[PDB]
Amino acid sequence: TYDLSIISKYLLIASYICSYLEPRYDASIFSRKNP
Amino acid sequence: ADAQRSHYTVYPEKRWELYHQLHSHFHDQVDHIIDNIEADLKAEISDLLYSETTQKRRCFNTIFLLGSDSTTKIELKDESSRYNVLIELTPKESPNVRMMLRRSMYKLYSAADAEEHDVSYDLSLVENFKRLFGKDLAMVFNFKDVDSINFNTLDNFIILLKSAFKYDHVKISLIFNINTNLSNIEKNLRQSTIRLLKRNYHKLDVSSNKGFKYGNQIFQSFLDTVDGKLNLSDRFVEFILSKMANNTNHNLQLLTKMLDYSLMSYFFQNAFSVFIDPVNVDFLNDDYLKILSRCPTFMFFVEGLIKQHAPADEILSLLTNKNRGLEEFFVEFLVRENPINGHAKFVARFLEEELNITNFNLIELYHNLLIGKLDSYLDRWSACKEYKDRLHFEPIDTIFQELFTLDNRSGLLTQSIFPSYKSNIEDNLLSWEQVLPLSGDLDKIMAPVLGQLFKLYREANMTINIYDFYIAFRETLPKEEILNFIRKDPSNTKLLELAETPDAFDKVALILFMQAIFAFENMGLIKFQSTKSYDLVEKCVWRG
Amino acid sequence: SPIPQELLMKYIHYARTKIYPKLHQMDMDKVSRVYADLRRESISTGSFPITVRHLESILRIAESFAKMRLSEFVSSYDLDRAIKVVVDSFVDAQKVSVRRQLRRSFAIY
Amino acid sequence: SLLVKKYCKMTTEEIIRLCNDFELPREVAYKIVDEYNINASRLVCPWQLVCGLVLNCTFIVFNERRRKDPRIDHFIVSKMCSLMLTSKVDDVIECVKLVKELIIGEKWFRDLQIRYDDFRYDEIIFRKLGSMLQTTNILVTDDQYNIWKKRIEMDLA
């Protein structure tokens, strides 16, 4: 269980999102309006 | 004139003294705690480095210092008739197998001659060290930042050290200062070398934050240094709960920073700071007597006075109608010790050894004290259930404490220490009116140079065309002002020939546009994608 | 533990052919307040809107629950189950990106 | 719930009805028509935008009374919550926070702040600057305290 803090924990959890994701799809599926 | 040459040198309080007697006295408590963990870390490596007599005696002893900050210094024993040397290898000095060997042999060799009172810098010295320097050798390897190194270089390095195990006059010891994540390290190496590593391993933890044995300690020594002369408000301390939780590695250096800066705020603006010693009652003035009046607990108690005593002739007399009794009304409540400090020190040592509990944070313990949540604080162990009545304290609504307190009621040290960086820049460029108040009449009818494109810079696409952005930029500039501006000066001559040109407005726009977008590259707001084409750029800065 | 099948199917025909529960304007205007929040929050975060047909639907679901409760009129908390039925159908009929609406409807849940 | 009954036009006679009750001067009263005419083209919902602009200017034109009386700040919004017949005060504040950043990239508000000389200015140039001598609002300020004092002590005697 890793030492890093809470905002850094969400900083890691957003970085794993672009593993299999590309810029062609992400802005559509995460709108405010296997690899 | 000279600014293009780099690094040219040149050779061109009644209140504050009461700070000076408080600040250093606090800092004697700081650094004495700092050498305690410094003596702690230096001790627990030293005994564990020795006395480990394994039976095979053909293996190096390794030590994993988990959670360590890559800066942990080590001292060594003298241990006569044998030299004991320290080698450090920074990932900056880890390019290959080759220079990791060659610099490291160099670093001990000068350390060998300095104690000794031409040769080749490789393992040739290691066997002949008995003959080259007399006494035997016990080297130690302070691998500073171990996870940045390409591990196959490290794996090929340790096999090179494995060949030195057949001379019997040399002893090897490895120190692995990881940052974290021991499970990551057994993934990266070759498994044939982990079985070489696993002979006598020791997973000693070294962390500044380990069960808050020093975090709760340094806040405690803060409290007695400011005991009885001040308070710590609720909104202040939750900031110390929240923000210090965002930095795992070094709380202790951070808690020194945000507390001492908070104390610097109090001495610099509060006039009643002089009155924390009662000897300074002779410095009293009507200006001091006037500013005491706007205290919130002062006026609220007067509202408490009128409703309790509906006769208000006494209360009106002790108001500014008198001044001698008025300050005597103040110095009645002057010496309030506020035993929440002492009640904290009462309960801190208790659960430390009576129930013997260590996983606790004294700051939120002080914070739950400030609301009355001490009962809902001790619940998380269910061990003070026999003691919740004797460790009980209801926080009383104390009076006149708002003059001796610390709180981020202004958002100061929120701003000046943790600044909303790209927020404050972007707020500076959309608004610009709350930063800036012949030719200034133009300024009241025309925006400053950097900010006037920024409103359209928001209103532009992801990747934008340069010229149409200028075409949009030329819309925001009205024509009559510029020819009023370019013909303002009759003294200069070289400008005036440009001023009479009929295409001056469209030329002076591209000059001014190529001074602003020229100046949006050192800020990194706009990136010039695909150089030598530069027809389109990319904007990375978004509002959030 | 549950209601038997024969009594349930006889209760369906008994309640559907005898009662007609209406609504009284005493405190029903509060649902027009909460619809006023719930419509607006579907524009800013969501893409699909909420219309007057959803208001007609929750009044029908509340009077259907009052019909099943066999009362004289619709109660005040039948609309709570009606708004729960419309939230877990409309919010569940969208993407995962309306996830903030899962907690935005938690204040009336 | 008139604010959620969207897609209706507020004509030139209609909008000046909406600002003469809130006491707007002629400078902004034509400007509201001027910027609705800007935003009649690219709109999405006409009810939300027309009220979000009228609150923040009344926040900035009446701040010589708003900073000197905190009670009238609920008075100006609730008299519109009765005029627009809103649900509560939850949704109306959600509008005024929304369109404020939507008008921060325009021209006239950067004039209307510095024309009205209203703001306070020397606080913001000392708050954003990070001044140690800035006001800490653990206190009540001397003017509002004297407003509190002269109201209470004359109520007293």
- Cβ burial C91-101 (10 Å sphere, 16+ → b, else e): beeeeebbeeb
Whether the CB-CB separation of B284 and B331 falls below 8 Å is answered with no
B471 vs B505: CA distance, rounded Å: 13
Token pair of B402, please? 């708002």
Strands B463-465 and B536-539: antiparallel
D85 vs D1: CA distance, rounded Å: 5
Residue of B nearest to D107 (CA): B447
CA distances from B356 to B60, B214, B307, B359, B366 (A): 38, 16, 49, 10, 19
Nearest to B434 by CA among D156, D17, D127: D127
B256 vs D7: CA distance, rounded Å: 58
D and A touch with 3+ CB pairs <8 Å, answer no
The residues pairing with B86 across neighbouring beta strands, listed in sequence order, are B140
> Within B487-534, where are the H helices?
494-499, 504-516
The total number of residues shown for chain C amounts to 109
The whole-angstrom distance between residue B381's C-alpha and the CA centroid of its chain comes to 32
D151 vs D136: CA distance, rounded Å: 24
Nearest to C79 by CA among C65, C64, C67, C62: C62
B535 vs B465: CA distance, rounded Å: 6
- Minimal CA separation from C92 to chain A, in Å: 16
Closest CB to B246 among A2, A3, A7:
A7
Nearest to B60 by CA among B145, B129, B159: B159
C39 vs D47: CA distance, rounded Å: 14
Whether the CB-CB separation of B38 and B178 falls below 8 Å is answered with no
C102 vs C105: CA distance, rounded Å: 6
**Is the CB of residue B269 less than 8 Å away from at least one CB of chain A?**
no
D38 vs D23: CA distance, rounded Å: 23
B104, amino acid identity: S
3-state helix, strand, coil split of chain A in percent (to 5) is 50, 0, 50
Helix (H, G, I), strand (E, B) or coil at B311: coil
In degrees rounded to 5, what are phi and psi of residue B41?
-65, -35
Nearest to B112 by CA among B150, B83, B76: B83
C and B touch with 3+ CB pairs <8 Å, answer no
Task: Check C39 against D86: CB less than 8 A apart.
Answer: no
DSSP sequence for D91-137: HHHHHHHHHHHHTTTSSHHHHHHHHHT---HHHHHHHTTT-TTSPPT
Whether the CB-CB separation of D123 and D134 falls below 8 Å is answered with yes
> Within B226-361, where are the H helices?
234-244, 252-269, 286-291, 296-308, 313-316, 324-331, 340-353
Tokens 């929750």: give the residue: C58
B338 vs B401: CA distance, rounded Å: 9
Nearest to D107 by CA among B457, B446, B423, B436: B446
Q: What angle do the packed helices B340-353 and B362-371 form, to 10 degrees?
A: 130
Resolution in A: 10.0
C80 vs B76: CA distance, rounded Å: 73
CB contact set of D18 (below 8 Å; sequence gap of 6+): D10, D50, D54
CA distances from B460 to A25, B316, B425, B453, B542 (A): 22, 65, 19, 10, 11
**Residue A2 with chain B: CB contacts under 8 Å:** 180-181
D23 vs D80: CA distance, rounded Å: 13
B440 vs D70: CA distance, rounded Å: 36
In degrees rounded to 5, what are phi and psi of residue D111?
-75, -50
Whether the CB-CB separation of D134 and B410 falls below 8 Å is answered with yes
In D14-53, the residues whose Cβ lies within 8 Å of chain C are 44-45
The whole-angstrom distance between residue B149's C-alpha and the CA centroid of its chain comes to 27
D and C touch with 3+ CB pairs <8 Å, answer yes
The helix (H) or strand (E) run that includes residue D145 is helix D142-156
CA distances from B188 to B63, B132, B441, C86, D80 (A): 18, 38, 68, 53, 66
CA distances from B122 to B105, B247, D26, D38 (A): 6, 42, 89, 79
**Residue A33 with chain C: CB contacts under 8 Å:** 47
Whether the CB-CB separation of B52 and B171 falls below 8 Å is answered with no
DSSP letter, residue D62 = S
Strands B536-539 and B526-527: antiparallel
In degrees rounded to 5, what are phi and psi of residue B357?
-115, 135
B221 vs B348: CA distance, rounded Å: 12
CB contact set of D103 (below 8 Å; sequence gap of 6+): D53, D56, D109
C91 vs C105: CA distance, rounded Å: 9
Tokens 């639907």: give the residue: C57
Sheet of B526-527, strand order: B463-465, B536-539, B526-527
B50 vs B82: CA distance, rounded Å: 14
Phi-psi region of B79 (alpha: psi -120 to 50; beta: other; left: phi over 0): left
Nearest to B62 by CA among B235, B224, B178: B178
B537 vs B530: CA distance, rounded Å: 8
Helix (H, G, I), strand (E, B) or coil at B289: helix
The residues pairing with B137 across neighbouring beta strands, listed in sequence order, are B83, B170
> Within B226-251, where are the H helices?
234-244
- Nearest 5°: the CA angle B151, B152, B155 is 85
The residues pairing with B536 across neighbouring beta strands, listed in sequence order, are B465
Tokens 């003691």: give the residue: B387
B490 vs D4: CA distance, rounded Å: 61
Q: Is B45 exposed, middle or buried (0-12, 13-18, 19+ CB in 10 A)?
A: buried
B537 vs B250: CA distance, rounded Å: 41
Whether the CB-CB separation of B426 and B540 falls below 8 Å is answered with no
Rounded to a whole number, what is the distance in angstroms from the first to the last CA of chain B? 40
**Residue C34 with chain D: CB contacts under 8 Å:** 87
Mutate which: D102, D114, D129, D138, vs B, most B CBs within 10 A = D138
The whole-angstrom distance between residue B470's C-alpha and the CA centroid of its chain comes to 43
B104 vs B107: CA distance, rounded Å: 5
B477 vs B486: CA distance, rounded Å: 14
B71 vs B325: CA distance, rounded Å: 60
Whether the CB-CB separation of B254 and B244 falls below 8 Å is answered with yes
- Minimal CA separation from A5 to chain C, in Å: 23
Nearest to B287 by CA among B274, B278, B304: B274
Tokens 């509008």: give the residue: D95
Number of H helices, E strands in chain A: 2, 0
Tokens 């619940």: give the residue: B379
Q: What angle do the packed helices B234-244 and B362-371 form, to 10 degrees?
A: 150
Experimental technique, in short, is cryo-EM
Rounded to a whole number, what is the distance in angstroms from the first to the last CA of chain C? 27
B90 vs B143: CA distance, rounded Å: 7
The helix (H) or strand (E) run that includes residue B41 is helix B16-49
CA distances from C14 to C2, C7, C11, C17, C68 (A): 19, 10, 5, 6, 10
DSSP letter, residue B205 = B
Sheet of B61-64, strand order: B61-64, B170-176, B136-143, B82-89
Nearest to B453 by CA among B439, B466, B462: B466
B48 vs B204: CA distance, rounded Å: 9
Tokens 């629950």: give the residue: C65
The total number of residues shown for chain D amounts to 157
Rounded to a whole number, what is the distance in angstroms from the first to the last CA of chain D? 48
* Number of inter-chain CB pairs under 8 A, C vs D: 24
The total number of residues shown for chain A amounts to 35
CA dihedral (B478, B483, B488, B493) positive or negative: positive
CA distances from B12 to B8, B242, C109 (A): 13, 44, 71
The whole-angstrom distance between residue B50's C-alpha and the CA centroid of its chain comes to 36
Token pair of B503, please? 């295409």
